[PDB]
Design a protein around this ligand. Structure first.
Ligand code: BJ1
Ligand code: NAG
Ligand code: NAG
Length: 856
């Protein structure tokens, strides 16, 4: 079976002599089927018996090209929970680099009631994880060898299906991985997210596999921060091939795909609950140039009444692109503008780069450099004593070593000092791969096994130190070779630590470019420097879905496209979709035509449609916020693939041009130039048009959805109750408004929903239980508002003043009881054609239990 051959010459075009040299098999009978492949027996074997331990078992593995092979390998397996299996493969005799991650070591006894069983084979070594309930083989290394050299470690697994989702950071273009022969390199790199499928800004080894239509799913995570590649083949099978550290694997079983994400996030860390304001709309560009220009853009979008919470300021606010300064001429009056923003209920987020100008003297001192030098907190060259010099925006630079706890002290004080001048509200950390305009350093990199390893994965440009730091550079956590992929992660950890001081008791907002597994505990993510093309629009959906799997649910691209002038039609469709990315920001590159919504004209279709859909986003913010609460507390996704709700239906398995907000809201954008319709899949559920309330005819079928220039498809799922709040142009204001309920009835006239409500900004409202959690349930004739947690009463005296019911016969004699005690008659408006009832003249106070009853 050619589909099962594991490639033995991953480094060069295949030849018989090399193959012979490697003791592999040769069979040149493509495309991509390996000509040279590992023999069926020629790997590691178990030495002696396995050893029962308290956590699981250990085995000793012994071996009979890419550096020193490790002769004796220790397998350590731990039955951590009923649904999480952990195994490490280490050097029996030498300690090796391991990621200094949230994840703690396991000091436990083996969990009870396992959903999985593990089987080890001895001659040759293989590891298999099967699901106990149906003996479905989930992990199975037997397809390939274990390879364990100092700078080349490889393990493969067969997969039980081709329903495979995950890996990053890349532009995959499709959400489902085909399992056609494909190699995905992972090594944090500043590169364009384009159709080339290169390594991008972040490193995410997690994948999820939907096993079958029952929903049974599993996930695999590799805890490894060295450059690596993930090799996919049609067996189906996946191979991990890394150039350092150890093979430290976790396997997660769930009954559903969402349960798999929850298991993964339980291990690596669930996402931060964002500030409610950060759910609003964000506007930004590279190079307004002057404060006057920035204010002009701010004012025209406010004039247009655009829902608009946050303004970002990019490196043009700085004095010559230097951190923690502003330009006293072009940005003269920045403090008064920040007061203006605040007074208008808006927030300022500032960009902050890691790299710190080293240009400092008696004449013109640069404080951040002087103070950081005093603290000795920079990344050093291999000599371990001289700060590494590279180049970024301000010129020659040194780079903070965020892995050193003293650096976060330095960093905090810098933000403290700057915040005294410019009262920013959130922080955008960029260029933190880390990105270097020179290769390695201003003196390049020394030739050695770190900078020039035996094997290099197929990373962009084919050198590790390309546009980053020397691999032999030295930080508190180790050498750059091992911790390069942790730069952005440690930076976000440190920036969150700074936020503890700058915004006491607040969440604030942190947006990061580079990430590692677990970055979502600290920061939001955006998909980087995209381009104003229809390709980039389409590619954004899988990227958003993937980051939700990764526990970074607040994710979005640069709406309308960073690079290039945006066509009006593309920007209009992108704003329409953009009103529904979990992170919604319009951002633009240097020099390009303006693409802020109001720049298209005060009476333009793009402005009108933008305002219209942003008003729907803001209306649905209580529902979106409640989704982020579930993501934070339980590990649920926010932007969700259809297959997560509809896995029983194999027509959902590669849908990637549509997605859900949580379980209940279906989003169908137009993603094709010139189009006024879209080919869409309608899952097996009752659906209601959001704007009209009318039940679609469609069910479990492909349709051509008619969507003119001012429309994006939005459908509400029957069985669900959506809390709403009357929109306004800021969430400061919107949070004071009356609330509503949209009850989308299922075929049985029933629905369920919930609402999380806290102060929208205090850190640890969830850990300290200072919040409201209520549940809504509808049966025929009755709505029940039930209160499950009631330790926060909003002092704005909020109430539900409207209930809209979809797919209903006329409700008559509506009664509102506050524990069996009625209170006068609400007004009911009924549309008998559309089957929509709207209950108004009602005053259901937030946090109070009610029963609303009717007859037919
Ligand atoms: O095309 S480019 O502008 O020159 O792209 C460069 C940066 O990634 C852009 S940064 C991130 C983006 O969101 C901010 O607006 C930009 C200013 O801080 C790379 O070329 C540097 O290697
Ligand atoms: C970097 O160099 C300074 C001396 O210049 C030293 O104090 C510091 O600990 C070094 N950092 C690392 C990570 O080795
Ligand atoms: C919206 O907020 C503005 C304050 O900017 C306020 O004047 C107005 O009353 C608010 N109205 C709504 C729709 O809540």
């Amino acid at each position: 079976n050619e589909l099962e051959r594991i490639n033995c010459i991953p480094d060069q075009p295949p030849t018989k002599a090399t193959c012979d040299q490697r003791g592999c098999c040769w069979n040149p009978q493509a495309v991509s089927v390996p000509w040279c492949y590992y023999s069926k027996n020629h790997s590691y074997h178990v030495e002696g018996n396995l050893v029962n331990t308290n956590a699981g078992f250990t085995a000793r593995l012994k071996n009979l090209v890419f550096g020193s092979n490790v002769d004796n390998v220790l397998l350590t397996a731990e039955y951590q929970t009923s649904n999480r299996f952990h195994f490490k493969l280490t050097d029996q005799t030498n300690n090796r680099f391991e990621v200094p991650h949230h994840v703690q070591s396991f000091s436990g006894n083996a969990a009870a009631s396992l959903t999985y069983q593990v089987e080890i084979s001895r001659q040759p070594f293989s590891i298999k994880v099967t699901r106990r309930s149906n003996n479905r083989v989930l992990f199975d290394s037997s397809i390939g060898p274990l390879l364990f050299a100092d700078q080349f470690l490889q393990l493969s697994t067969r997969l039980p299906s081709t329903n495979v989702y995950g890996l990053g950071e890349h532009v995959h273009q499709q959400y489902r991985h085909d399992m056609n022969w494909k190699t995905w390199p992972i090594f944090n790199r500043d590169t364009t997210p384009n159709g080339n499928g290169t390594n991008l800004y972040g490193a995410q080894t997690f994948f999820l596999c939907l096993e079958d239509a029952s929903g049974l799913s599993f996930g695999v995570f590799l805890m490894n921060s060295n450059a690596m590649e993930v090799v996919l083949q049609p067996a189906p099978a996946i191979t991990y091939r890394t150039i350092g550290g150890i093979l430290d694997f976790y396997v997660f079983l769930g009954n559903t795909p969402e349960q798999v994400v929850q298991e993964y996030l339980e291990l690596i860390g669930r996402p931060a609950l964002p500030s409610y304001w950060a759910l609003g709309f964000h506007l930004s560009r590279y190079e307004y140039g002057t404060l006057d220009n920035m204010r002009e853009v701010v004012e025209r979008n406010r004039a247009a009444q655009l829902p608009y919470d946050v303004q970002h300021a990019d490196i043009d606010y700085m004095d010559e692109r230097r951190d923690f300064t502003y330009d006293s001429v072009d940005f003269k009056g920045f403090p008064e503008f920040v007061n203006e923003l605040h007074n208008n209920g808006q927030k300022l987020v500032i960009i902050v780069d890691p790299a710190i100008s080293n240009n400092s003297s008696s004449s013109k001192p640069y404080g951040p450099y002087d103070r950081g030098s005093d603290m000795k907190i920079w990344v050093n060259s291999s000599d371990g004593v001289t700060p590494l010099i590279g180049e970024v925006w301000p010129g020659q630079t040194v780079f903070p070593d965020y892995t050193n706890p003293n650096c976060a002290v330095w960093w905090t004080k810098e933000f403290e000092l700057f915040h005294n001048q410019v009262e920013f509200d959130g922080i955008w950390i960029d260029m933190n791969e880390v990105s270097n305009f020179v290769d390695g350093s201003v003196s390049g990199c020394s030739t050695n096994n770190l900078n020039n390893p035996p094997f290099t994965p197929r990373i962009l440009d084919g050198y590790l130190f390309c546009k980053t730091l020397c691999m032999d550079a030295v930080q508190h956590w180790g050498k750059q070779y091992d911790i390069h992929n942790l730069y952005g992660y440690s930076m976000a950890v440190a920036t969150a630590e700074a936020a503890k001081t700058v915004f006491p008791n607040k969440r604030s907002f942190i947006l990061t470019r580079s990430t590692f597994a677990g970055s979502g505990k600290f920061a939001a993510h955006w998909l980087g420097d995209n381009t104003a093309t229809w390709d980039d629009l389409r590619w954004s959906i899988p990227g958003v879905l993937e980051f939700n799997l990764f526990g970074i649910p607040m994710v979005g691209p640069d709406i309308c496209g960073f690079a290039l002038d945006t066509p009006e039609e593309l920007c209009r469709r992108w704003m329409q979709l953009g009103a529904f990315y979990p992170f919604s920001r319009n951002h633009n590159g240097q020099g390009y035509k303006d693409q802020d919504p109001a720049s298209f004209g005060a009476d333009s279709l793009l402005l009108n449609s933008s305002r219209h859909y942003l008003n729907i986003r803001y209306t649905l913010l209580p529902y979106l916020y409640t989704l982020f609460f579930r993501a934070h507390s339980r590990g649920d996704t926010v932007a969700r693939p259809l297959l997560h709700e509809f896995y029983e239906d194999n027509s959902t398995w590669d849908v990637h041009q549509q997605f859900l907000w949580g379980p209940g809201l279906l989003i169908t954008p137009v993603l094709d130039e010139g189009a006024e319709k879209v080919m869409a899949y309608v899952p097996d559920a009752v659906w209601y048009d959001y704007e009209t309330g009318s039940q679609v005819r469609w069910r479990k079928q492909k349709v051509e959805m008619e969507l003119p220039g001012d429309k994006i498809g939005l459908h509400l799922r029957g069985g669900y109750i959506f809390p709403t709040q009357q929109p306004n142009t800021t969430t400061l204001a919107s949070r004071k408004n009356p609330l509503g309920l949209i009850i989308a009835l299922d075929e049985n006239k029933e629905a369920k929903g919930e609402l999380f409500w806290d102060d929208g900004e205090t850190k640890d409202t969830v850990a300290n239980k200072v919040y409201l959690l209520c549940e809504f349930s509808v049966t025929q004739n009755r709505l029940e508002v039930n209160i499950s947690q009631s330790t926060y009463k909003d002092p704005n005296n909020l109430a539900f003043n409207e209930i809209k019911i979809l797919g209903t016969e006329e409700p008559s004699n509506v009664t509102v009881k506050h524990n069996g005690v009625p209170s006068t008659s609400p007004t009911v408006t009924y549309d008998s054609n559309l089957k929509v009832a709207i209950i108004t003249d009602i005053d259901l106070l937030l946090g109070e239990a009610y029963t609303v009853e009717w007859a037919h």
